[PDB]
Design a protein around this ligand. Structure first.
Ligand SMILES: [Zn+2]
Lengths: 86, 59, 50, 122
RNA sequence: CGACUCUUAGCGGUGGAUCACUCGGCUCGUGCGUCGAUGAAGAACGCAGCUAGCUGCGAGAAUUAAUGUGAAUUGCAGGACACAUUGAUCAUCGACACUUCGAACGCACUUGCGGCCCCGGGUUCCUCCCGGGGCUACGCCUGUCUGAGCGUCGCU
RNA sequence: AUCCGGGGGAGAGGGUGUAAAUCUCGCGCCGGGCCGUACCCAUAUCCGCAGCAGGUCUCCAAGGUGAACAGCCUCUGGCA
RNA sequence: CAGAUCUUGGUGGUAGUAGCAAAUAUUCAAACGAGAACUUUGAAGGCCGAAGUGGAGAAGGGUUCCAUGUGAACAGCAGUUGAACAUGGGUCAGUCGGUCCUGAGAGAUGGGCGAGCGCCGUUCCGAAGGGACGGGCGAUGGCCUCCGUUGCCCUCGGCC
RNA sequence: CGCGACCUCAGAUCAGACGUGGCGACCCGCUGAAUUUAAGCAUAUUAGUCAGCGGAGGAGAAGAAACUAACCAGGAUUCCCUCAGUAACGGCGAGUGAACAGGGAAGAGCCCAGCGCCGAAUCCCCGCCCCGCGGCGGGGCGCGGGACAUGUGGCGUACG
């Protein structure tokens, strides 16, 4: 039918892991992500889902580089001068 | 042996040959479920797999 | 499947490494709160991607 | 045991590699001791060695770049490493003595009508 | 009335309200007001003696070096240190590293296929097979080199 | 994709003991990275909120009666 | 605060009640064991009866696979068993597949459109071939004999 | 039917550069609805608002009148109070709705092209050597390259 008798035919996967967002949104039959949009050059961000800008903007990650700009700035971007040796 | 993930069978031969000053006939490398590339190093007939075993520490 | 891609086999490797229970000695740390692992899953009650 | 970084700064770059490969064999040996039994004596020691290789490698990488950064000083085209990395903007925006220039017209006016102190009784 | 039921009280259970706490939030103000092709934001994978996440970090991976302090970390074993000395632990971090995906950059998205130059095996010039090293994106500016035209001319 | 046969004759080869060629004729040497590889495959390991009478693609296919892979009984194999 | 078929949390009567009835079927003895209608062995009686209640695969699951052990919890009774729980172990390729090829289709530069992220389009308004035999010269290399090799040019090549 | 200028126009893994993306609380440029109100409803209102697209900065934008005035006249921009919920718009319904003048915060001014004069007096880059140099600058040395007459640099711009 269309109830439980039709749920057995579900043995295909339209989506799969994306390569940029990391989520499961990479629509296979047409090659375009859902959560970020992969082949395009612009991260998909919309203002109608404010709880979707909170999940993956700046802060939620590890910040391998934006963390040490903040440490660097407090002193003024010092360069090449080791502290006075002993 | 257990070998880094990105390592050819051509590369494992050189490492063991240069490490223990030994000879290798052929190598077989599966990759375990955990993600470590297990490697089976068939030893050359000129050498005794026990006598090399004692050197590298394993009983 | 026994035709799994390399990437999938790698992803199904982390999901095995982190299925273990907590080490016993964790509970005795001075500031310690956890008392049994929570993320732990059983392959009949969770479907890996959902 | 313990190897300071205050005796490694001067040894030859062909002498360090001798000790660097010595440890990597010593670390290789200990890793066996973990798998095939061993005791708590050797297991804790792996952390002592694994940081020694950090000490020796860093000293090499430092004397390799300090020498190079002496080689490229006084030159005008130096590789992308040895140039400062400040930000995106503090390289394209600022300038040494290029955005401190005054035209002839601007120079002569400041030269001719200089600003000078005064004060007024009430 | 022994039972059953009802009402109240003592006690014991199911339950977590009230009360007091609080390394948490909301709101207001001040100072500063800084990301990225030298590779950002985000994502995957890894790393501890025992360790799953949480945090921290990147094959130098629960950190290296330097400075300041000055005798610990600790859940258990181990030993580092003559604490005597660069000298345990922590804070700062200016030096030194920084895997793979990502604007993502040889073509692709399957650890797939390549080219061009250097080094070591493979050679001993004898071409290959192996490993290591450096490049191989689009648009755009100035300059260089090579060029195309029954475009405009000059000359022999 | 790849592999092959045919036509045509630009070229090569030596001047009398030897060549150039074998759409390798018989031998001989060296090399063949990278990733998947267990198991279930279903009235229990999949989808239906589960050890759900539902659903989901194929290969193998004995003896007897019988037109027959029908129905029914038995052997290899399996089950409570 | 008594109410809003009020929100969240909790507990009753119903109630030890409905129920544990789809596909013929179990019995005797023995073993470990504290314990046995259910676990294991043996004997018997039955069924699935090769379009299977059999022997393997693809999708899909992702360690359920195998061994040792456990008696909290789950397996709508139980259980000495498990698909559970705790430790260990396991997946080896020139020749089996992937990779290579094109199929319906998808898609970028050229071009066109568009306020704009981009869009239409696939030979279509494009200087789209970076390769080769030989030849002339310069020029190394190694027995600069001879050939491997290199730069300029002459030639050759449909861009489909 | 060769040689040499210039003009248009390509290819370079040519030397040296730069953009791509992220954040978006504040800002700038486009695009731009419907619930709602009118006791219905279409103009109107909600409103040039939310949603969409682009682009930066620690601030953006604006800015030294092709101005306001009509006075005995003020004097770039922005911001506060006031003018004012007024003038004006509106199925003149619902509703919408500024500005000049005043006092304050701050106060900063200017540069070109053209007209023309100066022997392109102008400029980018290579190479050499001397100095500094972790915002690549200065000293000179070059019968070293190129741009530039289809116009660079100084004087000079409505206050002349
Ligand atoms: Zn994505």
């Amino acid at each position: 039918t269309k109830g439980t008798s039709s749920f057995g035919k579900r043995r295909n996967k339209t989506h799969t892991l994306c390569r940029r967002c990391g989520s499961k949104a990479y629509h296979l039959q047409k090659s375009t992500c859902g959560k970020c949009g992969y082949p395009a050059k612009r991260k998909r961000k919309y203002n109608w889902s404010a709880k979707a800008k909170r999940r993956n903007t700046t802060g939620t990650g590890r910040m391998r580089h934006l963390k040490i700009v903040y440490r660097r700035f407090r002193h003024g971007f010092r360069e090449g001068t080791t502290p006075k040796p002993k | 042996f257990i070998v880094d993930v990105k390592a050819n069978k051509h590369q494992i031969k050189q490492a063991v040959k240069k490490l223990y000053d030994i000879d290798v006939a052929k190598v077989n490398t599966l990759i375990r479920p955990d993600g470590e590339k297990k490697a089976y190093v068939r030893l050359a007939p000129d050498y005794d797999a026990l006598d090399v075993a004692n050197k590298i520490g394993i009983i | 499947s026994s035709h799994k891609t390399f990437r999938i086999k790698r992803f199904l490797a982390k999901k095995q490494k982190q299925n273990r229970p907590i080490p016993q000695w964790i509970r005795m740390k001075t500031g310690n709160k956890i008392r049994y692992n929570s993320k732990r899953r059983h392959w009949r009650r969770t479907k890996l991607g959902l | 045991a313990k190897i300071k970084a205050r005796d490694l700064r001067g040894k030859k770059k062909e002498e360090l590699l001798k000790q660097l490969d010595d440890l990597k064999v010593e670390l290789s040996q200990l890793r066996v001791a973990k798998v095939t039994g061993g005791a708590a004596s050797k297991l804790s020691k792996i952390r002592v060695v694994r940081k020694s290789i950090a000490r020796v490698l860093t000293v090499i990488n430092q004397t390799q770049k300090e020498n190079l950064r002496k080689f490229y000083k006084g030159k005008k085209y130096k590789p992308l490493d040895l140039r400062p990395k400040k930000t995106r903007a503090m390289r394209r925006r600022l300038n040494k003595h290029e955005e401190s220039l005054k035209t002839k017209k601007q120079q002569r006016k400041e030269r001719l009508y200089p600003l000078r102190k005064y004060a007024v009784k009430a």
